[PDB]
Design a protein around this nucleic acid. Structure first.
Lengths: 93, 176, 1083, 93
RNA sequence: GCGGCGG
DNA sequence: CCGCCGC
């Protein structure tokens, strides 16, 4: 089935939790630009007509791929609602 | 590949003084085995027209010099009286099966395309008998029997086959 | 191909006129072929005499009913939407009180439909069928009481619905209980009314009961006689004048309520035999001489007391016994409504007797065809009984032509009560197929009738038997009535015979629905043939004897859905009815008399009879069936041929050579493939597509009307308002599309213009094909019925070729149904030692669970036929046997392997290898030569088969053969709409469709739950918002996607908004609130 | 700022509030005028009282000021007269 | 809403 | 239960 869905589930306290993080994260991948990733170096996702999955095929695939690693953090109230989107636009073209 | 009867517009029509229906006829035409002799012959159009009290057989096609019809006595139709049948049937050299819907040939706006049956072989069979000569009895003796409609020959096919096999074998060349 | 049949049970008499049901029923219904001097006694004329002698003094009598000039012809009735009816009038004469004067004249009273040579009707354009009906044959029965296990109650039931429902019950507290229509009253009360005096009554009645103490009781009301008639009237619920107003009592006298069924056998049969004995008149009718005669009442009670007393004759009546069940033939059905019209007319004429100047009134002043026409017309076009003629294929229509229904008038049987009726009753033997019933709700309630089953004088499906005397069997056949069959000891046809003499001591027979082993001396009657036990429909399954009844059904019903294939092949193995079905069904055209052929056109066939007549038989070229299937007649005769009487001149739709054929015989290996034949999937060889093996022609009839709006008449012309010329090519004829054109989805089939515009019949998404026929009905209508407002009509017939593809579903006569999963290239599919590859591969697994060995049998015999090049005819229960098949298979080994020995070669190393695994399997007797071995393995019905992909054998013999399989009216053309976006309802905001846009599947709550459970939050949100009501949501969504973006967030669904307001619209004030209870804005 | 809708409330309507949600008062009974599909004024379809006919219109309300009072059938004919029970007058007659 | 079929 | 086809 899916890549380390097992690992994923073990990282959250509840199933549905996983989905939410996964999603919203896919949102940020496209909204604030598609370079807002954390594992772009060697070993980033990919497709087969050419090696172009390096730009924007499926967002979620990235999310999960990124969450599989200890790069991102998710919590009930980590960062003040509005401040998050303001800082993100600034540091991502 | 395609057919056209003069007064017929659709494949589901009926021609006066002609027992068989368009569909029954075109069907019989896919049973027609023609044989060209050179690449220069990609698309040949056989023409035939007979009238009155007669039985139309594949030999009634007006000779096309280099290309020959080994399907002579094939029954094309039965004509009563005042049975006017003039038609042009398009032929082609191809490979495999092609649905009349896939190609959709249109020589004349009112002609109806026919289904493509390109395999010049009806059946292949091979046997593996025990022995001819050798130090050890555990040996294989392959004899294969091929059947052809006539277009090409048993040997001819076998060879082409063998070639297509070889052709593919080479495709193992450049790694990546 | 030689035709060998294995029938050993001397089939004594040929099957009857399969459609006789309807045919004859209408003939006798309306005796219009023969003069009135010997005019019938039933149907039309009877219904006439019924309500004709009119007496209001006025006197209008019946003379003769004549009809016969059909306005137009059949086909014309179809092409013009015209109903094929006959004109009906009749001579009526009015006699006057003035004995010296009378009036004769004729008045045409509407048109009545006619019956086709096939047995079908033609109402408004299309062909319809009047299906049979079953019920409690109006008679008298005695059934056990509801709760009280004590004594039983009497029932008196006579149709029509207007007639009273009478019951008779005796209670503890006291006396009789005779309840009519929701109320009860003393059984004596009436008796006294009629003349039955306490004395006479008790004596003859209680001379054995002791219950009588129930009747003779009136010591108060029983001493007044006529006064009891008035007494009874008071017992009517309504307050009415006590002045002898027979009225409601007049009702249950002689005229309306009871029945006008033919005097003698209609209701009287239930009388004479069942209870009491003689009938006077038609029913308990005698309102003559101030006093009344009711020769029916006392007997009913006279049996009640017998019933509760001794064994004067044990009458416990089994309701469902077909012997108290009548079947309503078309005739009785039409005639019924006919007399209703007769009544409706007789209603106004009596009103028109007091209404005018004496002799000033003549025929017209008394007759108005208004009642009768609406009457009849209503039945054929509105009655829940007349339906679309299921013509997927001839057979189909034929079944639908003879099936029996329980639901209908409502007074015979309803929906929620049937567990009892649904069972195949004991009596259904040879009278109702036990297999023909449909699966699902409505089971056992609607079913087709048996083989020889033919309706007698009044319904009771009779069946044929063979009287036998001593050890001698006769050909003298009698059609017994369900009830009469119980009196005897009938025996099976399987009983060994030496011509006319029985052959065994313990010879089976069935007493009364009970299996009993009787002696040759006691066999009074014998079964005609095993056939009669089932239906025509069922009688078509080869080895039915080896097939579970449950799946056999699936098998019967499936034939009804077979679709006409261009190349029609009769089953490699048949039952023996195929010939007959095509024959009594009217698919093919036969030669009347001996003679010779003249012209054998592809449109007509003209032959010269040796008697002195030359006829031209046109052949329906390519007609559109009701279900959209091809119906062509393909001449099978050459110019100048001496034809035998009753020989196929041309073949019908699926009947080629005169045999019935639906689908084709294909070589089939019975094994498992990857998963392509997983649960019920089937694998097909591209090779089949190549020889157009499975290809059916289909037609879709798109219709457009030039409506007349008060905004300006919708003209029909080549003028297409938006400027296209590339889409106006095919539309060459000004307005119409040209014959022979290729119409694709979205092209204009017909153009039209209407007021504020292009309103044009276009090719509905899905497909079109080639336009083949066109019909236009302009102003000066020849003889067509153009609806009102309808300026002119345009009909466009389109057709295309259906080649078998992956979605399509086929199935064999036994019940194996399935869809095509993968179309394999001959290249790598299961091939036999000799180059011959198989056509289809059936998954073995679907045979054990379902119980239908019959298919595995057909396949074995089918294997013999392939190499023996012969077709066989195996009777229902009497067909081919396991030994005889092995015999023919042995013959087949010499063709298969025999030519193999001469052609020059022996056994493969592969053939030897599978033989090893076969002997270790126990299929072959260890120690014999491969030659001998393979034969023994072939006889088992299994041969060796090499993969085709690997060329390596498939360890273990696999069975293969010629199995007859059909394609069903299931094309995937009706199975796939793919909608991205489009039209929405303007009233509710739903993505409804119509012309270019498909509809969206519904989601129902049943599926929402599904989602809820998953925790599919947004997936659910999306289904109720972005995809349905938030007009701004779906909008943002669309845009976003156009942008390759991320759909916006949901705003308050208009449903929320719309609710706040709907709630504001009323006192109620729905206010949404924030965290801390405060306001929040949707807007 | 803007808050997730967590609670919804049904209350009675003060005549003052009826005027509150209200935009203009429909003062006249002129459904459709043929001359211009353009709405005939101050009946039902007027645009001030509801809004602009061209390219939030179907979200405003209007009020009709009744001469002498009338009552809500919903509060008078419901099995238990909400007003008949409360007031103590014959509840239903 | 009536009727017919399919799962 | 859902999907279709037609007065």
């Amino acid at each position: 089935a899916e890549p380390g869905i097992d690992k994923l589930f073990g990282m959250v306290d509840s199933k549905y939790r996983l989905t939410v993080v996964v999603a919203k994260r896919a949102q940020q991948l496209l909204r604030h630009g598609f370079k807002n990733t954390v594992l772009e170096p060697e070993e980033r996702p990919k497709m087969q007509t050419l090696e172009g999955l390096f730009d924007d095929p499926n967002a979620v695939t990235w999310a999960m791929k990124e969450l599989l690693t200890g790069r991102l953090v998710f919590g009930e109230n980590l960062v003040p609602e509005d401040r998050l989107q303001k800082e993100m636009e600034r540091l991502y073209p | 590949t395609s057919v056209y009867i003069e007064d017929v517009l659709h494949e589901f029509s009926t021609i006066p003084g002609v027992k068989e229906d368009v569909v029954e006829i075109i069907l019989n035409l896919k049973e027609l085995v023609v044989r060209f002799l050179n690449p220069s012959l990609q698309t040949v159009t056989l023409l035939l027209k007979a009238e009155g009290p007669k039985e139309v057989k594949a030999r009634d096609f007006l000779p096309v010099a280099d290309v020959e019809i080994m399907n002579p006595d094939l029954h094309i139709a039965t004509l009563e009286e005042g049975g006017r049948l003039n038609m042009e049937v398009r032929v082609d050299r191809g490979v495999g099966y092609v649905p009349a819907e896939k190609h959709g040939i249109k020589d004349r706006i009112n002609a109806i395309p026919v289904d493509a049956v390109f395999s010049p072989v009806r059946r292949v069979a091979f046997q593996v008998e025990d022995t001819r000569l050798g130090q050890r009895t555990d040996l294989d003796k392959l004899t294969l029997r091929i059947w052809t409609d006539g277009s090409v020959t048993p040997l001819e096919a076998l060879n082409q086959a063998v070639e297509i096999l070889r052709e593919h074998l080479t495709y193992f060349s450049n790694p990546q | 191909m030689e035709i060998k049949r294995f029938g050993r049970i001397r089939e004594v008499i040929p099957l009857p006129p399969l459609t006789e049901i309807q045919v004859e029923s209408y003939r006798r219904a309306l005796q219009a072929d023969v003069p009135p001097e010997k005019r019938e006694n039933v149907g039309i004329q009877a219904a006439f005499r019924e309500t004709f002698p009119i007496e209001e003094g006025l006197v209008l009598d019946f003379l003769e009913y004549r009809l016969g000039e059909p306005p137009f012809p059949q086909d014309e009735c179809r092409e013009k939407d015209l109903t094929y009816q006959a004109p009906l009038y009749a001579r009526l004469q009015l006699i006057h009180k003035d004995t010296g004067l009378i009036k004769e004249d004729e008045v045409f009273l509407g048109h009545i439909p006619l019956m086709t040579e096939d047995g079908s009707f033609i109402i408004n354009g299309a062909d319809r069928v009047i299906v049979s009906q079953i019920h409690r044959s109006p008679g008298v029965y005695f059934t056990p009481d509801p709760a009280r296990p004590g004594r039983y109650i009497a029932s008196i039931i006579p149709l029509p619905k207007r007639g009273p429902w009478i019951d008779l019950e005796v209670e503890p507290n006291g006396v009789v209980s005779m309840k009519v229509n929701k109320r009860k009253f003393p059984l004596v009360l009436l008796l006294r009314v009629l003349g039955y005096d306490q004395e006479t009554l008790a004596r003859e009645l209680g001379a054995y009961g002791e219950l009588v103490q129930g009747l003779m009781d009136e010591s108060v009301f029983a001493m007044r006689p006529e006064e009891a008639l008035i007494r009874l009237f008071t017992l009517l619920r309504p307050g009415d004048p006590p002045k002898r107003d027979k009225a409601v009592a007049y009702v249950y006298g002689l005229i309306a309520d009871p029945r006008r069924y033919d005097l003698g056998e209609a209701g009287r049969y239930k009388a004479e035999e069942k209870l009491g004995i003689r009938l006077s008149g038609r029913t308990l009718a005698r309102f003559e001489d101030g006093e009344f005669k009711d020769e029916v009442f006392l007997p009913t009670l006279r049996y009640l007391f017998a019933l509760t007393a001794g064994v004067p004759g044990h009458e416990v009546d089994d309701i469902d016994h077909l012997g108290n069940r009548r079947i309503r033939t078309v005739g009785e059905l039409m005639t019924d409504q006919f007399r209703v019209g007769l009544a409706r007319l007789a209603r106004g004429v009596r009103e028109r007797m007091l209404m005018g100047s004496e002799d000033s009134l003549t025929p017209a002043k008394l007759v108005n065809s208004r009642p009768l026409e609406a009457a009849i017309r209503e039945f054929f076009s509105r009655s829940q009984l007349s339906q679309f003629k299921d013509e997927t294929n001839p057979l189909s229509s034929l079944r639908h032509k003879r099936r029996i229904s329980a639901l209908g008038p409502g007074g015979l049987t309803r929906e929620r009560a049937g567990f009892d009726v649904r069972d195949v009753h004991r009596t259904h033997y040879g009278r109702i197929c036990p297999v023909e019933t449909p699966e699902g709700a409505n089971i056992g309630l609607i079913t087709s009738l048996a083989a020889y089953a033919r309706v007698d004088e009044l319904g009771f499906i009779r069946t044929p038997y063979r009287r036998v005397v001593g050890g001698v069997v006769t050909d003298e056949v009698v059609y017994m009535t369900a009830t009469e069959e119980d009196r005897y000891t009938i025996a099976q046809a399987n009983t060994p015979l030496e011509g006319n003499r029985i052959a065994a001591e313990r010879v089976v027979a069935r007493r009364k629905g009970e299996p009993v082993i009787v002696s040759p001396e006691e066999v009074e009657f014998m079964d005609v043939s095993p056939k009669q036990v089932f239906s025509v429909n069922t009688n078509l399954i080869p080895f039915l004897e080896h097939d579970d009844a449950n799946r056999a059904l699936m098998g019967s019903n499936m034939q009804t859905q077979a679709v006409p294939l261009i190349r029609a092949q009769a089953p490699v193995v048949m039952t023996g009815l195929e010939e007959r079905v095509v024959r009594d069904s009217l698919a093919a055209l036969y030669a009347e008399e001996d003679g010779e052929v003249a012209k054998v056109d592809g449109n007509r066939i003209v032959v010269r009879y040796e008697d002195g007549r030359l006829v031209e038989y046109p052949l329906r070229r390519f007609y559109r069936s009701n279900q959209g299937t091809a119906l062509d007649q393909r001449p099978r005769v050459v110019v100048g041929q001496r034809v035998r009487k009753g020989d196929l001149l041309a073949d019908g739709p699926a009947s080629e050579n005169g045999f019935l054929a639906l689908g084709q015989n294909v070589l089939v290996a019975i094994m498992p493939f990857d998963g392509y034949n997983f649960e019920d999937a089937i694998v097909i060889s591209e090779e089949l597509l190549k020889r157009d093996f499975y290809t059916s022609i289909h037609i879709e009839r798109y219709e457009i009307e030039a409506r007349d709006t008060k905004l300006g008449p919708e003209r029909i012309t080549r003028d297409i308002p938006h400027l296209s010329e590339a889409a106006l090519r095919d539309l060459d004829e000004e307005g119409v599309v040209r014959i022979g054109a290729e119409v694709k989805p979205g092209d204009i089939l017909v153009g039209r213009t209407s007021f504020k515009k292009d309103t044009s019949l276009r090719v509905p998404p899905g497909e079109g094909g080639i336009v083949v026929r066109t019909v236009r009905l302009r102003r000066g209508d020849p003889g067509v019925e153009l609806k009102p407002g309808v300026r002119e009509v345009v009909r466009v017939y389109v057709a295309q070729k259906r080649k078998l593809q992956v979605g399509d579903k086929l199935a064999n006569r036994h019940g194996n149904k399935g869809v095509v999963a993968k179309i394999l290239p001959v290249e790598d599919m299961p091939h036999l030692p000799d180059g011959t590859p198989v056509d289809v591969i059936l998954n073995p697994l679907g045979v054990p669970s379902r119980m239908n060995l019959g298919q595995i049998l057909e396949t074995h015999l089918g294997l013999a036929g392939y190499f023996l090049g012969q077709r066989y005819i195996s009777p229902i229960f009497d067909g081919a046997k396991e030994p005889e098949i092995k015999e023919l298979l042995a013959q087949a080994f010499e063709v298969y392997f025999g030519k193999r020995k001469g052609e020059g070669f022996g056994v493969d190393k592969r053939e030897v290898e599978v033989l090893r695994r076969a002997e270790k399997l126990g299929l072959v007797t260890p120690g014999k030569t491969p030659e001998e071995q393979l034969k023994e393995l072939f006889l088992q019905g299994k041969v060796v088969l090499y993969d085709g992909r690997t060329g390596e054998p498939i360890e273990g013999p696999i069975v293969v053969g010629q199995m007859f399989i059909m394609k069903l009216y299931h094309m995937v053309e009706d199975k796939m709409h793919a909608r991205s976006t489009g039209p929405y309802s303007l009233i509710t905001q739903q993505p409804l469709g119509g012309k270019a846009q498909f509809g969206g599947q519904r989601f129902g709550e049943m599926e929402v739950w599904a989602l809820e459970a998953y925790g599919a939050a947004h997936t659910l949100q999306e289904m109720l918002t972005l995809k349905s009501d938030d007009i701004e949501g779906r909008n943002a969504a669309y845009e976003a996607i156009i942008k390759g973006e991320d759909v916006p967030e949901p705003s308050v669904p208009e449903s929320f908004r719309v609710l706040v307001k709907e709630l504001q619209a009323l006192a109620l004030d729905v206010q949404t609130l924030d965290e801390k209870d405060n306001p929040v804005d949707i807007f | 700022m803007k808050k997730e809708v967590r609670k919804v409330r049904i209350a009675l309507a003060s005549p003052e509030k009826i005027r509150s949600w209200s935009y203009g008062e429909v003062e006249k009974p002129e459904t459709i005028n043929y001359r211009t599909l353009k709405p005939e004024r101050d009946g039902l379809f007027d645009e001030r009282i509801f809004g602009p006919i061209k390219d939030v219109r179907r979200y405003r309300m209007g009020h009709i000021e009744l001469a002498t009072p009338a009552a809500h059938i919903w509060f008078v004919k419901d099995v238990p007269s909400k007003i008949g029970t409360l007031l103590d007058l014959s509840a239903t007659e």
